[PDB]
Amino acid sequence: AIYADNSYSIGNTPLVRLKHFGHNGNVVVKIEGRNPSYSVKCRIGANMVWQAEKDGTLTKGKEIVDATSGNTGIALAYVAAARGYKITLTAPETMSLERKRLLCGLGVNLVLTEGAKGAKGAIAKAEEIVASDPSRYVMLKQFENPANPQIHRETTGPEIWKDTDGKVDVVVAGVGTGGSITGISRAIKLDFGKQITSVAVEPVESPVISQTLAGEEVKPGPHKIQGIGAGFIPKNLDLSIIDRVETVDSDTALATARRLMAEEGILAGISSGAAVAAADRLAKLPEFADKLIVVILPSASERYLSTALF
Amino acid sequence: AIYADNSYSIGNTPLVRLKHFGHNGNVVVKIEGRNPSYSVKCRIGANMVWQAEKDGTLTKGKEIVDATSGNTGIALAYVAAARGYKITLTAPETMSLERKRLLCGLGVNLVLTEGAKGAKGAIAKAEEIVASDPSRYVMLKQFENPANPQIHRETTGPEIWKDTDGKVDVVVAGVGTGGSITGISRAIKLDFGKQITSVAVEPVESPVISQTLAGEEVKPGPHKIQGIGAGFIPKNLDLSIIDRVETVDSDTALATARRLMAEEGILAGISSGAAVAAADRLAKLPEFADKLIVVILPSASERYLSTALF
């Protein structure tokens, strides 16, 4: 069991039972912070590169280009370094100095775009670079690339199934790209055949999944739950496998992550607190009392030291 | 496989083969950054608390007190939170704001001591607090507590043995408390019976193991390789199982950690770069060409964002 490079070491993350949430131990969390670059995105950074290699879209001589400084940028960075690809990431010039150092340390060619143009200015610049030589540059597109939910169907989902001996009843996951809840739900419902409850979590400040499913005007808004609440329905969110949508506010997400640290000894990130807050509400309904609830914790506390978390 | 609290999830860390170090793949690293509080010390924080419980020295009503803000303080903090103990950690008032926030976030009662008195002022204050009510306070003493090397003999060592199918020939580990190399070496040499080469790594700036074994005056000195080079021979370093001592300088340790990030996609800490630098030198000697060399990487890059690493 020696991995040929760090990308093959993804996953096999632990399940830990919560003591101060839920009722009689019915809430258990999956620690995706224990991954090669310390988030859930390490899995999709690995598999989007692997699938592009298998497809012949990524070859020696091609460079990865993408517009993300978040967990997926870190994930693609370590995978590019591990497997020998140059990578260019675009981000607004306003990103934190700590994240510039981290990405630069991983060997990223960091292209800083105009601060006033935000995430759109970064996406545009990435698309411009790709336009300049499309036989040279590959953009992996985490919100629509099916290799994102596929790796969760092949690893994350089966890990939950095996570690719970098939007893999982509910999966609770915040939705960023949708890949996690989509792949996990397809694995458990379709490959293992168990009719669990799949719960998407989104910010109450930007409840676009709730609004969509209710037929209401979609009205996104700003929030502090980094990693979820993108303000649109991503292609990699399979709405057909979502059974329930829970909304969580930013303050309670933060307070819940702080409780995970101080009361459970779990170094969880902000969206981890959002997911547990939604799971805790379900776990304290009598209809969920005999149900085993598994919660994805996407990231780790030290990635948030300069945030409202601390 | 649902852990009753985060302390039981320690270990089972991956081995990754290096591509830009060594010769023909003979250097493989063990990623101790993938642990509950993201370092090798998570194992000893867990087991020193467990053994104190078994010994009856730690009970409900007793509080942990120790003098460390480093990886062991973080480890004891998450374990204390996970298992329901109050913990007080003393540290000089000069510690980084980021580490105060991290320890405070984990629920630590942080007692800041006089900056001019350094680590000794913190150890004194911890011993004073324990003196004030010894039936109430427990100090676990990582440099002398045998539960430190014991957990490496029971987990870290057998993991290396199993993941290499018994083919490991050399173990390379920086020495802080000595617990890692001591426990790993006892496991492989005594429990599995293989006569491997155990290599301690220390700073060239503070080469007290080398000086001791040579019968020379022990002369410690300052260095930047956080986590190793304590300036004395700890009780938990079993010199009898050390076959070789390699010295590494701070600059090369830093440069090697940066290479691990940018060339291997491995988010290693500073002492991880020191250990790989020493392993790389051995791996390029013809006498080590057919030998499988396993290197402990104690911690992860983001714990070092405010250091010379970045």
XYZ file of C-alpha atoms in Angstrom:
620
model
C 0.000 0.000 0.000
C 2.464 2.589 -1.305
C 0.806 5.227 -3.459
C 2.636 6.084 -6.681
C 1.913 9.778 -6.066
C -0.127 11.772 -3.559
C -3.232 11.859 -5.775
C -3.821 8.125 -5.295
C -3.978 8.552 -1.488
C -7.363 10.355 -1.582
C -10.192 9.345 0.687
C -10.635 6.592 3.262
C -11.669 9.334 5.674
C -12.962 8.449 9.155
C -16.459 8.515 10.634
C -16.707 9.959 14.155
C -19.818 9.842 16.357
C -20.888 13.181 17.849
C -21.612 13.365 21.578
C -23.037 16.888 21.953
C -25.243 16.901 18.860
C -28.130 14.726 17.872
C -29.975 12.305 20.120
C -28.432 9.103 21.505
C -25.535 9.152 19.066
C -27.518 9.340 15.826
C -25.217 11.960 14.203
C -21.862 10.824 12.797
C -19.469 12.989 10.792
C -17.093 12.117 7.927
C -13.807 14.054 8.219
C -12.912 15.111 4.679
C -10.192 17.365 6.102
C -8.005 14.240 6.263
C -7.111 14.212 2.567
C -3.864 14.914 0.619
C -4.488 18.686 0.468
C -6.897 18.577 3.418
C -10.369 18.944 1.914
C -13.161 17.077 0.185
C -12.004 18.644 -3.089
C -8.821 16.542 -3.085
C -10.991 13.716 -4.429
C -12.283 15.688 -7.427
C -8.953 17.352 -8.136
C -7.542 13.852 -8.459
C -10.354 12.378 -10.518
C -10.915 15.291 -12.894
C -7.231 15.081 -13.830
C -7.321 11.264 -14.087
C -10.418 11.306 -16.288
C -8.973 14.023 -18.530
C -5.887 11.821 -18.940
C -8.057 8.823 -19.821
C -10.051 10.985 -22.258
C -6.913 12.228 -23.972
C -7.819 15.838 -23.153
C -4.896 16.059 -20.703
C -1.517 14.928 -22.058
C 2.141 15.714 -21.538
C 2.591 19.198 -22.932
C -0.831 20.475 -21.875
C -1.308 22.857 -18.962
C -4.182 23.065 -16.509
C -5.910 26.452 -16.356
C -8.740 27.233 -13.971
C -10.361 30.073 -12.052
C -10.451 29.073 -8.390
C -8.377 29.954 -5.341
C -10.644 27.883 -3.056
C -10.351 24.250 -2.057
C -10.549 23.033 -5.657
C -7.646 25.281 -6.646
C -5.580 23.803 -3.827
C -6.677 20.304 -4.879
C -5.772 20.817 -8.534
C -2.487 22.401 -7.454
C -1.277 19.402 -5.462
C -2.449 17.010 -8.193
C -0.702 19.025 -10.911
C 2.495 19.010 -8.865
C 2.158 15.306 -8.002
C 1.629 14.246 -11.631
C 3.916 16.711 -13.418
C 1.604 19.320 -14.981
C 2.034 23.065 -15.059
C -1.042 24.791 -13.668
C -2.260 28.366 -13.928
C -4.918 29.597 -11.516
C -6.595 32.978 -11.863
C -8.004 34.806 -8.842
C -8.890 38.421 -7.998
C -5.909 40.418 -6.740
C -7.824 40.772 -3.438
C -7.284 37.176 -2.261
C -5.573 36.686 1.092
C -1.794 36.738 1.326
C -1.942 33.357 3.080
C -3.712 31.732 0.134
C -1.341 33.291 -2.405
C 1.579 31.832 -0.448
C -0.070 28.409 -0.219
C -0.828 28.255 -3.949
C 2.592 29.691 -4.841
C 4.201 27.140 -2.535
C 2.450 24.363 -4.459
C 3.999 25.677 -7.689
C 0.905 27.381 -9.134
C 1.346 30.058 -11.784
C -0.925 32.540 -9.989
C -2.484 35.110 -12.327
C -4.074 37.895 -10.280
C -6.975 39.659 -11.974
C -8.654 42.996 -11.329
C -10.095 43.223 -7.829
C -13.204 45.111 -8.941
C -14.210 42.238 -11.255
C -14.335 39.595 -8.492
C -14.848 35.950 -9.436
C -16.174 36.841 -12.891
C -12.988 38.713 -13.760
C -11.016 35.608 -12.782
C -13.223 33.256 -14.823
C -12.949 35.559 -17.843
C -9.155 35.705 -17.635
C -8.990 31.911 -17.394
C -11.230 31.576 -20.442
C -9.064 34.128 -22.275
C -5.884 32.146 -21.545
C -7.549 28.961 -22.795
C -8.788 30.803 -25.891
C -5.217 31.899 -26.685
C -4.131 28.285 -27.324
C -6.875 25.657 -26.857
C -4.579 22.801 -27.902
C -2.384 23.724 -24.919
C -4.709 24.610 -22.017
C -7.325 22.473 -20.262
C -10.038 23.852 -17.992
C -11.618 21.162 -15.857
C -14.830 23.001 -14.834
C -15.750 21.623 -11.413
C -19.422 22.709 -11.570
C -20.190 20.649 -14.687
C -17.485 17.980 -15.010
C -19.124 14.580 -14.250
C -15.775 13.290 -12.951
C -16.579 15.373 -9.829
C -19.718 13.411 -8.728
C -18.263 10.207 -10.201
C -15.386 10.059 -7.711
C -17.858 10.483 -4.846
C -19.921 7.620 -6.273
C -16.783 5.460 -6.442
C -15.097 6.372 -3.138
C -16.929 8.676 -0.709
C -20.259 6.829 -1.011
C -18.877 3.280 -0.702
C -16.753 4.398 2.275
C -19.912 5.561 4.060
C -21.677 2.324 3.126
C -18.850 0.082 4.328
C -17.998 2.016 7.485
C -21.669 1.975 8.605
C -22.204 -1.660 7.519
C -25.101 -0.457 5.384
C -26.866 1.148 8.338
C -26.661 4.769 7.122
C -30.187 6.207 6.822
C -29.568 9.896 6.053
C -26.733 11.762 4.334
C -26.359 15.478 5.059
C -24.078 17.536 2.809
C -23.710 21.200 2.000
C -23.912 21.879 -1.731
C -21.170 23.792 -3.518
C -20.760 22.013 -6.857
C -23.288 19.368 -5.772
C -20.765 16.611 -6.541
C -20.634 15.149 -3.014
C -24.343 14.689 -2.339
C -24.903 13.649 -5.967
C -22.220 10.948 -6.030
C -22.832 9.703 -2.487
C -26.573 9.472 -3.100
C -26.144 7.647 -6.414
C -23.794 5.158 -4.737
C -26.042 4.334 -1.793
C -29.414 4.498 -3.553
C -28.481 3.003 -6.922
C -25.385 0.827 -6.381
C -26.227 -0.428 -2.888
C -29.998 -0.093 -3.282
C -30.895 1.562 0.043
C -33.601 4.258 0.025
C -31.914 6.779 2.307
C -32.848 10.444 2.814
C -30.467 12.773 0.971
C -30.369 16.236 2.526
C -28.794 19.196 0.719
C -27.715 22.099 2.940
C -27.549 25.693 1.725
C -27.321 29.152 3.306
C -30.586 30.727 4.351
C -29.030 33.877 2.832
C -28.860 32.252 -0.634
C -31.504 29.460 -0.639
C -31.597 28.918 -4.400
C -32.228 25.158 -4.232
C -35.192 25.736 -1.900
C -36.507 28.559 -4.089
C -36.105 26.497 -7.277
C -37.858 23.404 -5.949
C -40.716 25.586 -4.654
C -41.082 27.361 -7.999
C -40.111 30.723 -6.504
C -37.955 33.527 -7.869
C -34.304 32.608 -7.356
C -32.687 35.330 -5.222
C -29.090 34.659 -4.161
C -27.332 36.755 -1.563
C -24.045 37.097 0.317
C -23.158 34.809 3.210
C -20.108 33.625 5.143
C -20.404 29.815 4.692
C -17.350 29.392 2.479
C -17.594 26.518 0.015
C -21.394 26.309 -0.345
C -24.153 28.586 -1.599
C -22.812 29.434 -5.058
C -26.077 31.239 -5.932
C -27.149 28.947 -8.775
C -28.061 25.290 -9.338
C -24.848 23.621 -10.576
C -24.958 20.995 -13.295
C -23.341 18.548 -10.834
C -26.282 18.801 -8.437
C -28.651 15.970 -9.372
C -31.907 17.399 -7.986
C -33.660 14.079 -8.688
C -31.823 12.384 -5.787
C -32.360 15.232 -3.278
C -35.083 14.364 -0.747
C -34.848 17.411 1.530
C -33.187 20.838 1.573
C -32.176 22.423 4.892
C -31.178 26.088 5.198
C -28.650 27.321 7.762
C -27.619 30.869 8.650
C -23.994 32.051 8.644
C -23.846 32.908 12.368
C -25.139 29.504 13.445
C -22.793 27.779 10.988
C -19.868 29.604 12.599
C -21.068 28.919 16.148
C -21.553 25.225 15.313
C -18.032 24.897 13.865
C -16.708 26.494 17.068
C -18.696 23.930 19.081
C -17.215 21.101 16.992
C -13.742 22.313 17.969
C -14.328 23.022 21.654
C -16.897 20.346 22.516
C -15.954 17.460 20.197
C -12.273 18.080 19.501
C -12.988 18.097 15.752
C -11.086 20.724 13.768
C -13.903 21.465 11.333
C -14.304 24.322 8.853
C -17.190 26.759 8.452
C -19.324 24.710 6.069
C -18.766 21.731 8.381
C -20.594 23.718 11.066
C -23.412 24.479 8.626
C -23.849 20.798 7.767
C -23.843 19.681 11.408
C -26.307 22.456 12.343
C -28.740 21.148 9.713
C -28.141 17.536 10.783
C -28.680 18.457 14.458
C -32.093 19.928 13.651
C -33.145 16.763 11.795
C -31.639 14.484 14.451
C -33.840 16.073 17.129
C -37.081 15.411 15.243
C -38.800 12.221 16.503
C -39.147 11.094 12.893
C -35.321 10.816 12.713
C -34.758 9.270 16.168
C -33.910 5.746 15.033
C -32.039 6.943 11.910
C -28.263 6.958 11.466
C -27.331 10.394 10.068
C -23.973 10.816 8.283
C -22.664 14.370 7.765
C -19.903 15.427 5.360
C -17.363 17.784 6.999
C -15.601 19.269 3.931
C -12.490 20.960 5.386
C -10.302 21.716 8.416
C -10.112 24.580 10.902
C -6.643 25.953 10.176
C -7.679 26.893 6.640
C -9.973 29.457 8.368
C -7.675 31.114 10.918
C -8.117 34.569 9.304
C -11.919 34.282 9.130
C -14.834 35.018 11.431
C -14.442 31.415 12.618
C -11.630 32.555 14.912
C -16.012 1.648 11.779
C -17.499 4.618 13.636
C -15.120 6.077 16.197
C -16.659 6.871 19.583
C -14.709 10.148 19.660
C -12.033 11.774 17.513
C -9.157 10.382 19.599
C -9.850 6.833 18.396
C -9.429 7.900 14.738
C -5.639 8.399 15.060
C -3.244 6.945 12.546
C -3.672 4.750 9.480
C -1.692 7.387 7.601
C -0.658 6.798 3.974
C 2.703 5.959 2.419
C 3.543 7.878 -0.768
C 6.504 7.138 -3.055
C 8.689 10.139 -3.917
C 9.558 10.776 -7.566
C 12.101 13.612 -7.309
C 14.076 12.288 -4.345
C 16.024 9.119 -3.889
C 17.015 6.692 -6.618
C 14.528 4.528 -8.535
C 11.738 5.087 -6.036
C 13.557 3.972 -2.888
C 12.225 6.854 -0.719
C 8.639 6.673 0.556
C 7.053 9.095 3.016
C 4.427 8.548 5.740
C 2.000 11.500 5.935
C 1.398 12.100 9.639
C -0.351 15.369 8.764
C -3.459 13.259 8.083
C -4.433 12.830 11.734
C -7.315 14.203 13.888
C -5.458 17.439 14.735
C -3.130 17.088 11.739
C 0.209 15.965 13.168
C 2.145 12.971 14.414
C 1.477 14.181 17.964
C -2.227 13.321 17.666
C -1.186 9.727 18.373
C 0.595 10.535 21.647
C -1.999 13.059 22.771
C -4.520 10.248 22.468
C -2.442 7.546 24.112
C -1.010 9.589 26.980
C -4.578 10.462 27.982
C -5.792 6.865 27.503
C -2.938 5.436 29.566
C -3.454 8.001 32.333
C -7.115 6.937 32.418
C -6.117 3.272 32.638
C -3.592 4.125 35.374
C -6.181 6.004 37.398
C -4.081 9.181 37.254
C -6.674 10.841 34.989
C -10.279 10.682 36.217
C -13.436 12.742 35.979
C -12.729 15.839 38.027
C -9.043 16.061 37.119
C -7.691 18.651 34.700
C -4.835 18.339 32.237
C -2.060 20.906 32.674
C 0.946 21.123 30.388
C 3.495 23.558 28.994
C 3.364 23.306 25.207
C 1.814 25.400 22.454
C 3.323 23.162 19.741
C 1.852 20.103 18.077
C 1.506 18.228 21.370
C -0.497 21.093 22.867
C -2.845 20.967 19.889
C -3.032 17.170 20.215
C -3.832 17.252 23.930
C -6.350 20.028 23.283
C -8.435 18.054 20.797
C -8.234 14.932 22.981
C -9.287 16.861 26.090
C -12.230 18.318 24.188
C -13.136 14.955 22.623
C -13.118 13.108 25.963
C -14.497 15.811 28.263
C -11.492 17.136 30.216
C -10.633 20.717 31.023
C -7.109 21.534 29.884
C -4.764 24.367 30.780
C -1.767 25.063 28.560
C 0.942 27.546 29.489
C 2.986 29.330 26.827
C 5.070 32.523 26.658
C 2.984 35.611 25.905
C 5.016 35.920 22.669
C 3.331 33.013 20.847
C 1.669 33.781 17.522
C -1.860 35.150 17.428
C -2.805 32.319 15.058
C -1.788 29.661 17.579
C -3.577 31.415 20.446
C -6.750 31.431 18.346
C -6.349 27.763 17.412
C -5.814 26.653 21.017
C -8.574 28.962 22.282
C -10.873 27.595 19.586
C -10.230 24.077 20.885
C -11.350 25.195 24.356
C -7.913 25.444 25.996
C -7.511 27.554 29.121
C -4.477 29.417 27.758
C -2.220 30.811 30.489
C 0.286 33.231 28.959
C 3.554 33.552 30.861
C 6.283 36.183 30.807
C 7.832 36.573 27.369
C 11.357 37.050 28.716
C 11.254 33.620 30.404
C 10.571 31.670 27.185
C 9.790 27.957 27.398
C 11.222 27.670 30.914
C 8.829 30.307 32.229
C 5.958 28.299 30.744
C 7.170 24.996 32.224
C 7.590 26.635 35.635
C 4.078 28.091 35.586
C 2.647 24.696 34.631
C 4.539 23.049 37.482
C 3.303 25.784 39.840
C -0.334 25.171 38.852
C 0.114 21.434 39.415
C 1.797 22.122 42.763
C -1.217 24.188 43.871
C -3.482 21.103 43.845
C -1.774 17.843 42.792
C -4.934 15.788 43.350
C -6.586 17.949 40.673
C -4.003 18.533 37.917
C -2.205 16.014 35.699
C 0.888 16.801 33.645
C 1.537 14.196 30.984
C 5.214 15.000 30.224
C 5.728 14.072 26.573
C 9.544 13.801 26.811
C 9.464 11.048 29.450
C 6.007 9.441 29.348
C 6.425 5.899 27.899
C 2.882 6.091 26.491
C 4.448 8.334 23.799
C 6.774 5.674 22.239
C 4.272 2.933 23.121
C 1.600 4.244 20.747
C 4.165 4.346 17.934
C 5.090 0.738 18.719
C 1.401 -0.225 18.577
C 0.236 1.817 15.566
C 2.819 3.785 13.562
C 5.316 0.898 13.394
C 2.827 -1.846 12.460
C 1.307 0.471 9.824
C 4.731 0.815 8.189
C 5.266 -2.943 8.428
C 1.890 -3.824 6.916
C 1.848 -1.151 4.217
C 5.324 -2.217 2.986
C 4.562 -5.955 3.340
C 7.621 -6.233 5.567
C 9.924 -4.786 2.916
C 10.915 -1.612 4.807
C 14.706 -1.536 5.258
C 15.346 1.926 6.737
C 13.252 4.276 8.874
C 14.181 7.965 8.884
C 12.657 10.204 11.562
C 13.522 13.550 13.066
C 13.816 13.395 16.849
C 11.824 15.744 19.060
C 10.724 13.606 22.010
C 12.245 10.521 20.355
C 8.914 8.687 20.668
C 8.414 8.057 16.934
C 11.770 6.508 16.060
C 11.823 4.668 19.401
C 8.385 3.074 19.037
C 8.658 2.395 15.304
C 12.078 0.801 15.736
C 10.946 -1.369 18.653
C 7.951 -2.548 16.612
C 9.885 -3.505 13.491
C 13.053 -4.830 15.135
C 11.557 -6.535 18.186
C 7.928 -7.390 17.345
C 8.413 -8.165 13.650
C 12.059 -9.206 13.974
C 13.574 -7.350 10.997
C 17.030 -5.784 11.439
C 16.373 -2.455 9.737
C 18.507 0.704 9.908
C 16.993 3.303 12.241
C 18.125 6.825 11.380
C 17.583 9.740 13.770
C 17.624 13.204 12.181
C 18.642 16.340 14.065
C 19.651 19.907 13.181
C 23.288 20.454 12.347
C 22.840 23.593 14.490
C 22.013 21.491 17.587
C 23.556 18.024 16.970
C 23.334 16.775 20.553
C 22.662 13.129 19.650
C 25.724 13.104 17.372
C 27.841 14.843 20.015
C 26.659 12.471 22.762
C 27.306 9.281 20.811
C 30.775 10.573 19.860
C 31.608 11.446 23.468
C 31.881 15.159 22.676
C 30.756 18.211 24.623
C 27.029 18.696 24.067
C 26.499 22.159 22.547
C 22.926 22.958 21.499
C 22.067 25.981 19.409
C 19.155 27.766 17.740
C 17.644 26.509 14.495
C 14.440 26.818 12.475
C 13.415 23.121 12.181
C 10.326 23.341 14.373
C 9.501 20.140 16.234
C 12.992 18.594 16.420
C 16.315 19.520 17.992
C 15.224 20.095 21.592
C 18.876 20.488 22.685
C 19.013 17.470 25.000
C 18.616 13.685 24.824
C 14.988 12.996 25.828
C 14.113 10.021 27.991
C 11.847 8.782 25.163
C 14.779 8.478 22.762
C 16.019 4.890 23.059
C 19.611 5.370 21.863
C 20.114 1.584 21.859
C 17.910 1.197 18.751
C 19.462 4.118 16.815
C 21.815 2.881 14.075
C 22.701 6.203 12.431
C 22.298 9.931 13.098
C 21.995 12.367 10.179
C 22.306 16.140 10.611
C 20.431 18.621 8.416
C 20.690 22.408 8.257
C 17.681 24.722 8.610
C 17.957 26.273 5.124
C 18.058 22.904 3.375
C 15.185 21.638 5.535
C 13.106 24.617 4.401
C 14.122 24.257 0.748
C 13.301 20.529 0.846
C 9.830 21.141 2.322
C 9.232 23.672 -0.471
C 10.302 21.021 -3.001
C 7.883 18.516 -1.443
C 5.059 20.993 -2.053
C 5.974 22.152 -5.552
C 7.515 18.982 -6.994
C 5.574 16.199 -5.239
C 2.298 17.882 -4.314
C 2.850 16.940 -0.657
C 1.883 19.626 1.854
C 4.701 18.891 4.290
C 5.961 20.915 7.255
C 9.486 22.109 8.017
C 10.720 19.044 9.892
C 9.266 16.929 7.074
C 11.747 18.654 4.758
C 14.572 17.937 7.202
C 13.710 14.233 7.327
C 13.450 13.901 3.543
C 16.736 15.804 3.072
C 18.494 13.273 5.320
C 16.746 10.351 3.601
C 17.687 11.720 0.154
C 21.367 11.767 1.112
C 21.224 8.141 2.294
C 19.126 7.056 -0.697
C 21.824 8.288 -3.094
C 24.585 6.222 -1.479
C 25.165 2.941 -3.382
C 24.990 1.096 -0.067
C 21.291 2.100 0.185
C 20.355 1.525 -3.481
C 18.328 -1.652 -3.012
C 16.868 -0.514 0.343
C 13.307 0.692 0.909
C 13.545 3.908 2.968
C 10.469 5.091 4.912
C 10.422 8.710 6.143
C 8.102 10.159 8.796
C 6.565 13.502 7.723
C 5.307 14.880 11.076
C 3.002 17.768 10.075
C 1.301 19.783 7.320
C 2.175 22.961 5.434
C -0.648 25.261 6.526
C 0.525 25.102 10.139
C 3.608 27.019 8.856
C 2.092 29.810 6.748
C 3.622 32.536 8.975
C 7.095 30.953 8.964
C 10.162 31.085 6.749
C 8.615 28.123 4.910
C 6.433 30.563 2.971
